[PDB]
Design a binder for these strands. Structure first.
Length: 578
DNA sequence: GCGATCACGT
DNA sequence: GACGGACGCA
């Protein structure tokens, strides 16, 4: 493009409206370099070196002025990288990444060029073509870098209006401006704050694990003949199914299955199997959680700073990476103790955790208007026990533990939209038997059945389904003549208004909570979101206020035909917040 | 640099 | 045949 390579900041660069590019090339933008800045506004196109621009008091003033509106792509990346430099970014009124995510989350828009292609704009290169792939990644020389950054800013400048126009046609403009963009700032603060980690406690757990892995690893070698890579399903498969001749219950595309569900059925045949299961559990904790956390914890602050991917999933859920903090173990006690290493950032603070109880089935009761399901939540029943009572036609005192377990698994399948092979699998029954359970469910909950039928028809007719706050998911596969592919699209038509509305609700709750915390002059702060749960830390003197405030704000985020209900706990570590 | 397999929470 | 971090091979 035609643009100015500026040696200093000028007044015409600080207009009331601009496309702004604050380029961070490193994937993890925490404390990462800013390699260049581009500004496009009514007066022209400008490239600035960050050493110049970020030391200029008027430019910094302009970045922080809420009344100076900026249009950007992935403003959270820029906001966080600037936070690490002590600079506040305000006034971002349009985020092209989030706009493209809302318009079609299946596109996988991850740079300006991919978003621009959605509106037939191609005068910008993909970041990968400019910087390189993995190891071959590099920042090019200034003339090349400056043209790329100005071309990205020019693209944002030209694309704001067509994206906003389509968002408005879809009734998603408020979803962008009042939900996703405010949430992006809250996520930035959460990531920047980080979670404090007790690294010595993690190290001693790693030491304990490494000893136990060593003991089980040698026991496996004695029970087998040879030594082998227990972590490679191929070598393990030769040992189990050829050397020891265990029955082959399930094959994979490349060989025999050694999944935990197959190994458990093989346990009676040979002592080695239980040890492989034990090794898999321990190795999971060591490699994924202990080693992963120690690798990414910042050694100066002893904090981990995750990155929440706000623009990735087709349901509207967040994801979390580097480290992923949304799948820290909790089901088994050995892994749950890892949560003891997540601690408040200040002495005499505590961890506070609040979770919605059954938000997805409450959402389902609301959208389906199912009388039976609505009444169960209005009575605040144990929904798994109640589902077992209806599915199996027994009174509450005849629900056995196994009945409740199988009803909970049906509830899981309904809440996530898993296939009948999925449900049969984790219930260890036949696909046919799993389908009969679903059948008995629809008979006890005929409103849910009507809703499933109607929403599949709606998806076929409109081409998409929507959530309570107008998030959209397109389902072109709903007319596929491949039965599996079509069934998958049908389940996604059912599931997305459920899981996606629950995502809408907690995102609004986060916005409301952040505003309420400031109103009430609390020091408490949000640290993590885990799909239906919010994790905070606060001075211990604030716990009593948070016990009243947090559940109320989360419960009042939307109004449904059934109440929402939030449980909460607090303690000295994340583990204790139970 | 990839594709494949397994496993964690919600 | 829901979704979203970590051998094999190359």
């Amino acid at each position: 493009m035609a643009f100015t390579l500026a040696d200093r900041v000028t007044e015409e660069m600080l207009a009331d409206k601009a496309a702004l590019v604050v380029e961070v090339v490193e994937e993890n933008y925490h404390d990462a370099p800013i390699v260049g800045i581009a500004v496009v506004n009514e007066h022209g196109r400008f490239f600035l070196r960050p050493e110049t621009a970020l030391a200029d008091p008027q430019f910094v003033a302009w970045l922080g002025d809420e009344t100076k509106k900026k249009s950007m792509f992935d403003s959270k990346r820029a906001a966080v990288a600037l936070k690490w430099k002590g600079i506040e970014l305000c006034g971002v009124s349009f985020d092209l990444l989030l706009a493209a995510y809302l318009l079609d989350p299946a596109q996988g828009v991850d740079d300006v060029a991919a978003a621009a292609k959605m509106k037939q704009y191609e005068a910008v290169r993909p970041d990968e073509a400019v910087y390189g792939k993995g190891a071959k990644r590099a920042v090019p020389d200034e003339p090349v870098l400056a043209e790329h950054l100005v071309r990205k800013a020019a693209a944002i400048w030209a694309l704001e209006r067509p994206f906003l126009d389509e968002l408005r046609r879809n009734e998603q403009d408020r979803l962008l401006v009042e939900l996703e963009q405010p949430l992006s700032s809250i996520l930035a603060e959460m990531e920047f704050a980080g979670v404090k980690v007790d690294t010595k406690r993690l190290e001693q757990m790693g030491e304990e694990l490494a000893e136990q892995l060593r003991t089980v690893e040698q026991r496996i070698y004695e029970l087998a003949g040879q030594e082998f890579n227990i972590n490679s399903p191929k070598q393990l498969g030769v040992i189990l199914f050829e050397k020891l001749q265990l029955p082959v219950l399930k094959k994979t595309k490349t060989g025999y299955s050694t999944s935990a569900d197959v190994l458990e059925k093989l346990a009676p045949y040979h002592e080695i199997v239980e040890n492989i299961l034990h090794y898999r559990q321990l190795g999971k904790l060591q490699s994924t959680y202990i080693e992963g956390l120690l690798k990414v914890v910042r050694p100066d602050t002893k904090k981990v700073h995750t990155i929440f991917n706000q623009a990735l999933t087709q349901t509207g859920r967040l994801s979390s990476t580097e480290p992923n903090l949304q799948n820290i173990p909790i089901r088994l006690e050995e892994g749950r103790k890892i949560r003891q290493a997540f601690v408040p950032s200040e002495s005499d603070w505590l961890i506070f955790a609040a979770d919605y109880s059954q938000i997805e089935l409450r959402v389902l009761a609301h959208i389906a208007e199912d009388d039976n399901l609505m009444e169960a939540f209005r009575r605040d029943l144990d929904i798994h026990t109640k589902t077992a009572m209806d599915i199996f036609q027994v009174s509450e005192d005849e629900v056995t533990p196994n009945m409740r377990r199988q009803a909970k698994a049906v509830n899981f399948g309904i809440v996530y939209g898993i296939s009948d092979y999925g449900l049969a699998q984790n219930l260890n029954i036949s696909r046919k038997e799993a389908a009969e359970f679903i059948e008995r469910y629809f008979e006890s909950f005929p409103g849910v059945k009507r809703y499933m039928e109607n929403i599949v028809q709606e998806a076929k007719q409109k081409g998409y389904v929507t959530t309570l706050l107008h998030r959209r998911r397109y389902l072109p596969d709903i007319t596929s003549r491949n039965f599996n592919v079509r069934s998958f699209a049908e389940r996604m038509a059912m599931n997305t208004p459920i899981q996606g509305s629950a995502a809408d609700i907690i995102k609004k709750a986060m916005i409301d909570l952040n505003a309420r915390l400031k109103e009430e002059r609390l020091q408490a702060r949000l640290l993590l979101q885990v799909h239906d749960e919010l994790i905070l830390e606060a001075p211990k003197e604030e716990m009593e206020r948070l016990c009243r405030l947090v559940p109320e704000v989360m419960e009042q985020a939307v109004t449904l035909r059934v109440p929402l209900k939030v449980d909460y706990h607090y303690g000295s570590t994340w583990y204790d917040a139970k």
